[model samples]
Target: DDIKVAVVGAMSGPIAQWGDMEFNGARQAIKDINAKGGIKGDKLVGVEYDDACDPKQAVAVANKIVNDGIKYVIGHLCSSSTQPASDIYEDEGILMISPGATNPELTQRGYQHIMRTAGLDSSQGPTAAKYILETVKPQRIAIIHDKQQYGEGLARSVQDGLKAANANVVFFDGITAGEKDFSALIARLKKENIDFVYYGGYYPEMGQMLRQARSVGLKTQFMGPEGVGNASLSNIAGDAAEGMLVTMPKRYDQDPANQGIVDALKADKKDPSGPYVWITYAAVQSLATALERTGSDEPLALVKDLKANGANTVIGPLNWDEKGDLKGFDFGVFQWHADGSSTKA
Candidate 1:
């Protein structure tokens, strides 16, 4: 017998690192479970698809999954992709567990089978704002977003949080997500005498902004949300990425309790660090646990089990509230180095 699961993510794109991280964790979990005589005497087979973090591609992937009879999925990693695909999955009655999509509206949409292991941007944004206000204490600050749902919503939350903390926001604006040149943005920031800029976007755009800021003699300090937390930022911004601040979910790679899985990832030549790695593993674990308890792969039964009880996972107990979001999710700050490693700041 075979238990099929789909993993949808940006397998080939500028943000592919996020997809790779989710796939690594899901693949590792399947390997471990299949090695242990499989779940309920059936081996789990993973079907991979590249959504490219595009909503259109994500909906196409959802249709493909429905056609393929895959009842379970573990991705569509970005909020933009997840939101649209989520509607598709809900109408089709398939379950999808997202490892890193943080937009609050995803869970708030009243979809019972859709859930995420990551925290909401609502919580993350305030935490980031409070930390910067207290620690960095920059007098003149700016906030920028990529004009997409996730980036813009998160930026708005941070802006609200900063104002609540009485921090001065000098400029708040939006930029095109895929633009290469940010020299004009740099000049505008420089003209405003902005000492600190918070970008609520992914690594690709953030890296270009940082590099262009340096080129134009803007010495503004830079920070961003988890979308900008990947090591690839160093590759894009080179030396300019050094000393960049990022607010990320607390990492579990070094936790003594998770050492076993961490070692497993390392043995496979995969880095055991990053926001998505362990959470994706936990998502797989949640699905497996639900399957065991319900003794069925039926979506409604599995979702009922999930709501009625918590699953034990690498990240510890994952209990969902009515909204299908994990309780007690939180964030932390990190300082990036030129070599793509980050230390807690």
Candidate 2:
């Protein structure tokens, strides 16, 4: 029999690319492990559920997974989706490991069965602020959020960091998402003479905002958290995406130690460096290792083992804090090139 695990994500929305990467990574891990005679003679099976990055959809997906008898999950990709879905999984005692949700509140709420493999927005926010103060050093900065849980939370974190660094922050505000035109926001930014803008939102909104900002001749250096790191930003913003600075979690794909799995993913026509790719792979590996170590399929026991010890996975050794956060997560800065590529900064 195969151990059934659900891969929940936003597979059919504006940010489908992120979910695609998550699904691919988890699927690849299962394939690799099953081919190697399986974990303790039980092959791993993955079932996918799409939440479309909506909190309500995520709750429905969580209920579906629970009703379907899947005890483990590898997703619910966005913070807004993950946080609400986690409550369902927690009540059901199903273990969930999110590959991309970075909101600190996800872990701060004390859910034992929920964990994330990536860096939190708490770290990403301060890292963006630090880079702005030390590297960009803008005269006047502006902050905006998409008014979602992830966006607003990260926006306030960055605002606090900017204030702490004594940087001149002229504007801090939020905008309603799903509304395409941001010309009004751009006009206000220009009026304030903001030299840099830090936006906390996903790619669709960020891309549109960037395009509008540049069109209106507002060249304020735009920076954002990992939520805006998808390559679609380039497609949506066109040439405007060039030189956009973003904070991202470290991708372990290039490390020689990760080359084997990276090559495996490439052999399967998957790019291992995409957002949530390696992290989702590591999440699967961690789950398999815990199952093997505990020699059980019990979700509660698995959670206990995961919390009491660490697992060596594709992302390297990982141990979760009592709050369900990775023990030592960090962020890196990248500059987006015009060709939809990123370079280390």
Candidate 3:
């Protein structure tokens, strides 16, 4: 009785909610695969981990999973967690697909065994730039990053993208991660007459920014990546998030092409379109397609199939480069509505 797959995620910490959604999505995928008679009549065995979105913890959990002979992994949502964990899985020849973790550099390592359903930060950077210029039409932009690997790198990517798009990035700075105050920064932004702000970080700091901005009567709208989009923002940002925008990979809920997913989830009384829900489902479908195509339980065989033909997945046609990075897709811009709903734009 070999364990079929191990699912890893940020089970606790500041971003535990994200971990919940990721784990649930993978659990749903496992259920779907098993209901279809399991892989080769062998039921999938799942092992869950709490990386806590920390790279060091991710490495430990990854080692444990690999040592246990788990061949497939779905997880480690944050780019920080995934980046380190990937090294272990890659070294062990495990097949992994992350549903989150958008830092562009995560996949640039040329690992043939790793793939992700989310778009890379490299693409998102330029897209954010375009949105700032053409949509928000901000005269000046104040860019702030949280100094984490994903945050700093993505913020720079957005800056480069904006510059390429002919938008002037008036002020760009790095902020300390886990810092308690941004009021001084806010005053500087206001003094500089910054019309719009693009923060390259996650929810805890973002919520604080929104709360502080509102308290200071700074009416400027802010935007960020999917990392900042969460239910907590509804309460934290209050009315401020109404007009806030975030660039995220298109959610399944917004895609009419996801009807089949809806049907699949409904059969189990589950919702299929949560954030990365469908994309993670798509990752499972991709793995299944690889298994079916190769007809081999071997990891090398599945990798060959994935590289050779880019296993057709639920997220539409998918292909990966030799580096196991997404081949030709980009990110989407989504707006957070006042009622905690989001719409793709």
Candidate 4:
């Protein structure tokens, strides 16, 4: 008999490419565990679903995972998707470890079965706010969001934190996601003399906004959360992506704590450059540890063990609250370099 695990993520969507490394990391971890005579002698089997980063689709996938009898799950990348699906998994006693979703409210619900390998927006927001205030010290800051749960929620956190830090917030607003026409917003940005714009959303729209804003001669500096930084932004924003700043846990290269993980990436022929790869690798390792510890594919039991043990893995030292929320994974500020590349500044 085989112990079963599942990975759910945006396998088909604009963000699908981002989830590849996460799934790849999961696959590699499972392969290693199986090669080691399996987890407690039971071979681990993998299942996956293309949730498309939608909330309803995530629920459907959650129910499917329940029906298929998988005990451990490793995804649901968007916070909106993860938020709803978490309840279903908890009700059905399935252990879920979200690799990407970073909204703070998700874990605050107090679900014992949900654990995140990454830090939350609340952690990043304050750090980014302080950086913008102390380092850049821009005269006027503008905040915007995509109006999705993840985007709006994170922007709110950033806004509140920026206000608390005594930063000058000029114009804060939300925009419909995936809209092509930003002429109105461009006019507003220019008129407000917004020196810096921080967008709370993924790369596609953020890239478009940056490109459009630049075309309109706004020339404002830009920053965003993890949602806006990726290779895709290079193609999406083209030249507009240069010199932009984004915040997340430091890139894996900057963290000496993740050296072993960097070595593992080289051994596996994967680029260990970004925050997602490191967090995803740690997530897979943590899932494996919980599975091996319980020796039982029972979701509730595995979740109990995950929360109980303060296991230190490659990503960094780990501690969890009783509700299964992670602690101590802080945020990092990164700047896009002159060479169309980005690094922690």
Candidate 5:
């Protein structure tokens, strides 16, 4: 019999790239583990589900995994989707690892069954702040967000970090998300004479800020969290998006230890550079490692072993905190270009 692990995420949606990396990564791990003579003499299998990155669909996907009796899972990719889907898995007593959901609240709830391969915004914010203080060293700064959980929390974290360093934070505020016009917000930045700005939110809001700010002749170096570092950001902000800085997970594919997997992914026309790919691959391997070590599929049994000994994964050692987050992960700073490419900063 096979040890089935549900591979769940937004397999079909506008943001399907996120899901594809997880699926591809999980399948590759399954293939690799089986090729190496299996885990505990049981073949590993990945069962995938589509949540469309929607919270509603996530519940159904989690339910599908539960009904199928697959107690171990690697998924629900987006934080929004992962949060709702995780509620069901926790109540069902199923074990799950999220490769891409970085929201701190996901692990803050004290659920034993939930863990993440990704670092939270709390960790990412300080990384950006460090880059600012050491590298950018702007004359004056403005920090803003969308006032939502992900955005607002990230903004506050960066603000705290900046305040700790005694950086000159001239202004701090949040704007309504999805608002078309930023005339007033731009005015505030101009009034404060901001030489650098850091926004905490997804690409859409950052896009507008960049496009509008540039049009108003505001020549400031801008930065944001990973959410704002996307091809669509350039699409929305055009040349203004160039040179924007972002803090994202380190490029694991660039690691010498991961070169083999990296080449394998490229050979199969998959982009190993996706942030989730190695993380998801590590999640699958960690489960197999825990299963082989404990020889039991019970959630608590595997979790105990994982936390105590941890597992060496494609990215590196995956030690867990009581909150089920990776002990800690570092983010790298990158400069976004108009051509939708990012270079390490």
Candidate 6:
């Protein structure tokens, strides 16, 4: 019998690119494992479920996976969506690993089955904060988020990190996520003479904000968390995306050992550059390793082993704490360019 692992995330939404990356990586991981004889000679098949990155939809999708008798899952890409869906998965005793959701609260609830390959906001925020304090050293800074869990959570983490260092952060404010125009906010920042602005949100709003800020001649340095670092971001912001700073997990694809995966992904016509691509591959591979080690696919046994052991993945050797969050993980800072590309900073 084949092992059923549901690849659940946003398949058709504004941020569906992330979900596509997750599914594509999961499938590629499945292909690799199956070629190597798979787990106990059972094929690892990834079942796709679209949550649209919405919590309500994720809850229903979680239930649907349970109804389909799938005991393993690999997503709920956004933190807000993962938080609610994971509640159901935990109670149902299903093993769920997230590849992109980075909010610390997802693993803080002591869920036995929840895990993520991505780094947490706690590490990412401080990374950005320290860089801003030491490298950028802007006088007055503005902190912004979309008022969602992932956005606000990371935004606060950065704010607290800066405040602990006694950096002059002006204030934390919420923005409407789907809003197309940030001209009003750009004017405010211009008038206030803010030298730096940090936003915690996905690429769309950040893209819009960047374009508008640049169009209006606003020149303050702009930075954001991993959520805003996407190639499509520059597509939206055009040349305005240049010089934008972002904090993200280590570049796993750049690792020498991951070159095979990178080539395989390219051959399969999947994007290998997205941060979560290899992370999702690791999510699938981790479950397969757990199953192989135990000789059984029981969720409880596997969860226990996950805590007892560690996964060597493309991202690196990943060890989890009692709370299921990765231990000793850190974030990296990168700079985006006008040509829709980025490099480590």
Q: Which candidate is the best by lDDT?
A: 1
- Between candidates 1 and 4, which one is better according to TM-score? 1
Q: Against the correct fold, how does model 3 do in TM-score? A: 0.92
Q: Which runs in model 5 stand beyond 4 Å of their true positions?
A: 12-14, 165-184
The digit string of per-residue lDDT tens for model 3 on 1-345 reads 444777778878888877767776777777878889776776776778888999889999999997887898887688988989989888888888888888878777677778887778878788888888887888888899998988888888888888877687888898887777888988988898887999999888887887788788887879998788887776776777777889876665557866765776778786554677766776777777787677787777787788788866656789877777777767788888766788877
lDDT, residue 107, candidate 6 = 90
- Flag regions of model 2 displaced more than 4 Å: none
Each model's lDDT = 0.88, 0.87, 0.79, 0.80, 0.86, 0.87
Task: Give the range where candidate 2 is weakest over 10 consecutive residues by summed lDDT.
Answer: 266-275
Tell me the spans in candidate 1 whose CA falls farther than 4 Å from its real position: none
State every prediction's TM-score relative to the real structure. Answer: 0.96, 0.96, 0.92, 0.93, 0.88, 0.98
Q: Is candidate 3 or candidate 5 better by TM-score?
A: 3
Tell me how far the alpha carbon of residue 5 in candidate 4 is from the true structure, in angstroms, after superposition: 0.5
Q: What lDDT tens digits, residue by residue, belong to model 2 across residues 102-133?
A: 88888877787888897788788888888998
- Give per-residue CA lDDT, model 4, range 62-150, as digits (tens): 99888987877888788989989999988987788898888888788778788888788877787778888789888988899999988
Better of 1 and 5 by TM-score: 1
lDDT of 2 at 178: 83
Model 5 worst lDDT run, 10 consecutive residues? 10-19
Off by over 4 Å in 4: 253-270
Candidate 1 C-alpha lDDT tens digits along 1-345: 799999888898779998889999889999988888788889999899999998889989999999999999998798999899989899999999998799999988778888888789989898888888889999899999999888899899989999987789988999998999887788888789999988988999998888888876788899999999887898889888888999888778878988888888888899888768888888889989999888987887888789789898888788888778999988888999888988889
Who is ahead in lDDT, 2 or 3?
2
RMSD of 3: 2.2
**Clash pairs detected, candidate 5:** none
